[PDB]
């Protein structure tokens, strides 16, 4: 209960606003920082935050990418905040995290098609930092709402291989969390690495969404000329496994693709027209690349 003794900073006070703005530049210069993560922006004067971000970039002459934590599972509040701040910085996609959580706790009962709506990334793809879990949602934390482990890799494939949003990987998910509950996140490193690889060398080109099923949904990336062998076909399932015919671009017709996650051994050959029939196991994820 030590937090009860903290004091809330007053930004209507000229000296306080001038001081935080100045410290901001000092912090940036002392550490040679490239950007910021804004904490608890919900309780801070919106105009100040907008001015502080402008100030720091101006005094440094640097881009200073900035992402603010406006914790509200509501697209309306976040959108207002973006407007009040002149879209000068991104926000964490809180709604998306909450759907991931919901999908993971409903054991197949969730409508996967819902993932496509009500998220910052759906409305403002260039102003969204998508994440699966963080330090406030992990087991035992103030905003606890951990995405169940089985669903975790599916959530990561979603934020890392789709064209929209600036994805964020969590340390606790990679190396596991060191709390003392029986619900700690284990080190999923070995399961996220393949998805990171896919983002790194394959998630390029036009995207084709196939959110036409209550459980099995997917999407493709046609690849791009600038990145060799790029292109992919991702499929994730809430419940039962299955298959889906997806278009990957007539440009890569005749290729044999394989599940980079290794959950599936069977290769998929792209037909003359650029289509493929991909497969995914139940409560699993499959990312086919060439």
């Amino acid at each position: 209960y030590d937090y009860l003794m903290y004091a809330d900073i007053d930004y209507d006070h000229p000296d306080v606003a001038a001081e935080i703005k100045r410290w901001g530049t000092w912090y940036a210069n002392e550490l040679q920082l490239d950007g910021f993560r804004l904490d608890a922006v919900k309780h801070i004067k919106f105009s100040f935050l907008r001015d502080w971000v402008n100030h720091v970039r101006e005094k440094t002459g640097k881009e200073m990418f900035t992402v603010a934590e406006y914790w509200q599972n509501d697209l309306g509040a976040l959108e207002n905040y973006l407007n009040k701040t002149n879209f000068n910085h991104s926000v964490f996609d809180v709604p998306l995290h909450y759907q991931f959580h919901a999908a993971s706790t409903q054991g197949g009962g969730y409508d996967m098609r819902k993932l496509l709506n009500s998220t910052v990334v759906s409305k403002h793809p260039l102003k969204a930092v998508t994440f699966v879990d963080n330090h406030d949602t992990q087991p035992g934390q103030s905003l606890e709402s951990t995405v169940q482990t089985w669903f975790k890799p599916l959530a990561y494939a979603f934020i890392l291989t789709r064209e929209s949003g600036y994805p964020q990987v969590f340390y606790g998910d990679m190396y596991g969390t060191k709390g003392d509950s029986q619900r700690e996140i284990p080190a999923l490193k070995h399961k996220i690495e393949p998805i990171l690889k896919a983002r790194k060398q394959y998630a390029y080109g036009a995207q084709h969404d196939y959110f036409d099923h209550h459980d099995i949904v997917g999407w493709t990336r046609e690849g791009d000329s600038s990145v060799a062998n790029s292109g992919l076909a991702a499929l994730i399932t809430d419940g039962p496994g299955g298959a889906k015919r997806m278009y990957v671009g007539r440009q890569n017709a005749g290729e044999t693709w394989h599940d980079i996650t290794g959950n599936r051994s069977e290769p998929v050959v792209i037909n003359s027209e650029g289509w493929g029939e991909f497969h995914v196991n139940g409560g699993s994820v499959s990312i086919y690349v060439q």
Partner: protein
């Protein structure tokens, strides 16, 4: 290539002052796996060495001065932080610092302030008349002094607090007398 960010900390990591070294050592791995940016935990002095960083006592003390009974923060010293960031930069990875500016925690001393109580539901609706309380609002940073900054904090730089030290009461206070 695609940009990918990583939150490089977890709530329950060990308070062994080796986090910055860990990050410095982790630069090659991060780079080969496509991480192009890392968000690091609050690097400035908290209310204790074990503070995850959200206590936020001294923003100009990046684990450099002896305050809160320690020189280094939970993660390490300013030098280790700087070495870690240099490794990241050599590999083209960006570093995003955390900014904790909603409050300050760990005031050096209390100050007699005039306050009114507000409704816990409607934190605006005043449910008490003005009265003297003792609030932890004084920040002078004895370990640092005026190195980097001579700004000192007082009750008027704030809106309120949720603890009256005199009566040892938890209520929602709003400082009067122009706070």
């Amino acid at each position: 290539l695609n940009g990918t960010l990583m939150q490089y900390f977890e709530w329950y990591m060990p308070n062994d002052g080796q986090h910055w070294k860990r990050l410095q050592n982790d630069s090659a791995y991060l780079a080969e796996h496509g991480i192009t940016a890392v968000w690091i935990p609050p690097a400035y002095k908290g209310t204790s060495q074990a503070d995850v960083g959200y206590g936020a006592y001294d923003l100009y003390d990046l684990g450099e001065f002896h305050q809160k009974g320690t020189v280094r923060t939970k993660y390490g010293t300013k030098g280790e932080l700087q070495s870690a960031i240099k490794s990241l930069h050599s590999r083209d990875i960006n570093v995003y610092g955390d900014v904790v500016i909603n409050h300050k925690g760990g005031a050096d001393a209390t100050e007699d302030v005039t306050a009114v109580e507000v409704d816990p539901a409607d934190r605006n609706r005043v449910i008490s008349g003005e009265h003297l309380i003792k609030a932890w609002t004084h920040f002078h940073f004895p370990g640092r002094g005026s190195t980097y900054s001579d700004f000192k904090w007082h009750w008027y730089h704030f809106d309120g607090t949720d603890w009256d030290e005199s009566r040892k009461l938890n209520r929602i206070y709003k400082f009067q007398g122009k706070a």
